[PDB]
């Protein structure tokens, strides 16, 4: 099927909504407006990783969510961890997340003890940025074949230090995180596929609000939840297993269209 | 035809002063239509119908402008007067939800240049809640632009000023599955008829069947199954909102262009 991870940034400049749920009840209750609004999943993010973002220490991320996380566990809501710092992952596989959600995509071999010990499902993200994203360009030749070069080696890594194969979810990357062309992210979110395909694993795409979609359609920052959406159902199309959305209202009804015309063309 | 998707923008009367009919009709052009679809009264399952007289009092100033805009216009109206009305001051095209089954009309229509829309409908008029008959939609549709451009072409219309429009929503029905058939297969018109297909899904209820949302905004499923049907080669759209339409189209074909270029 597909499921859908609503974007709660815990942050004061994630790039689209910084600040907005950065007190843990403004975060509490747009999480439950997103699950509501059709997500499965709430991705809860304690710090922004687009360009212009700025880090903070691993006790901040962690106050940050530590109320957030109460809640939702309380609430049977099940949570993403959006961050990339070890000592932050840690503290959220304590208190039993459903997923962690690296943008460097578990790079540190010293952790890999602690996720081998866990249940938790793992987005792995692919990065030419191997990080924060910037506004560098990807390496010359085809960007399918560096992606699947980084998850063979990856999930090699991984599975050799006990973390089960299944527990693996793939994330391609998407927008800066794939360099500064828009034909790149473009390239990742048409030909998806061949890497469902090649490692018979899930895939994950966020393309909710990013750059390369003002830059098709010449639009400004608060303008680009219809190509979005566009995007996300071109994603749903392609067989994504997974989308992370800032709005999971507008895709669930778009979702709710695509799959009633499946259904009604079916000859069974 | 090889000719890129036109999309028709929405403009009804229904309360709309000219100088706002005008104004919205601008807006819409300005957001990504190509021609305005300006409707004087409503074809909904539930709007009161006007005179003859009143649609063209509605419409005549509104065309006053838009003509002297360079504006297309396409008049949405059942009613031979209006139609006469409006082939007379030279719109681009008549927007029938009748399909103009009214035959004594035919030697008007065949001395004009204005393109006809040709629509099916379960009731052959104003949309009710009826259901739609026993068998395969798309047969009952081919069937009737079977007969319709028959009687049509063999008024003297030429066959290139049509545009068939398979109807939707309570046009076909109260079943929600009636119009995801259409939307899905409208591809076999344009195939068996060689003329190009205009949808108008925008706000229809049966969207609504699937928001869950009853009376809430249905922008996003109208987005998705106008992208449906611009990726199923729909030739026209007919819209209430020409820009998140456009916005998604350029996503798509930014992304076809990945494919080949
Ligand atoms: N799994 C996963 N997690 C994320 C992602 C993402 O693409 N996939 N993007 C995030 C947002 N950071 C940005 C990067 C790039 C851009 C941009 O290109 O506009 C915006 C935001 C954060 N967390
Ligand atoms: N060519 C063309 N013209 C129209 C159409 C249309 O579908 N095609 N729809 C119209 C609106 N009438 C409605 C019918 C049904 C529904 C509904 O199903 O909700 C809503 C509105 C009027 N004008
Ligand atoms: N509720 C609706 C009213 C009008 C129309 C239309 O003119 O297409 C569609 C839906
Ligand atoms: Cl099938
Ligand atoms: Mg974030």
Avoid: C, W
């Amino acid at each position: 099927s597909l499921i859908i991870f609503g974007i709660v940034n815990i942050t004061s400049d994630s790039f689209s909504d910084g600040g907005r749920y950065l007190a843990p009840d403004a975060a509490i209750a747009q999480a439950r407006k997103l699950m509501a609004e059709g997500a499965d999943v709430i991705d809860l993010g304690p710090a922004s990783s687009n360009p212009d973002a700025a880090p903070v220490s691993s006790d901040t991320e962690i106050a940050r969510i530590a109320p957030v996380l109460d809640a939702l566990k309380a609430d049977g809501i099940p949570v993403s961890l959006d961050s990339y710092q070890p000592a932050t992952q840690a503290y959220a596989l304590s208190r039993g997340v459903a997923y962690l959600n690296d943008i460097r995509g578990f790079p540190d071999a010293a952790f890999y003890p602690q996720l081998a010990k866990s249940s938790a499902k793992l987005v792995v993200m692919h990065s030419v940025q191997d990080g924060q994203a910037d506004r560098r360009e990807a390496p010359a030749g085809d960007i399918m074949d560096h992606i699947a070069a980084f998850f063979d080696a990856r999930i090699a890594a991984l599975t050799g230090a006990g973390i089960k194969r299944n527990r693996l979810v793939l994330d391609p990357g998407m927008g800066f995180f794939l360099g500064a062309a828009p034909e790149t992210s473009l390239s990742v979110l048409a030909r998806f596929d061949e890497l469902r395909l090649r490692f018979d694993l899930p895939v994950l795409l966020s393309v909710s609000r990013k750059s390369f979609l003002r830059a098709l359609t010449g639009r400004g920052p608060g303008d680009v939840g219809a190509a979005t959406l566009a995007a996300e159902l071109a994603a749903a199309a392609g067989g994504a297993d997974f989308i992370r959305t800032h709005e999971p209202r507008p895709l669930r009804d778009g979702l709710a269209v695509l799959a009633a015309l499946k259904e009604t063309a079916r000859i069974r």
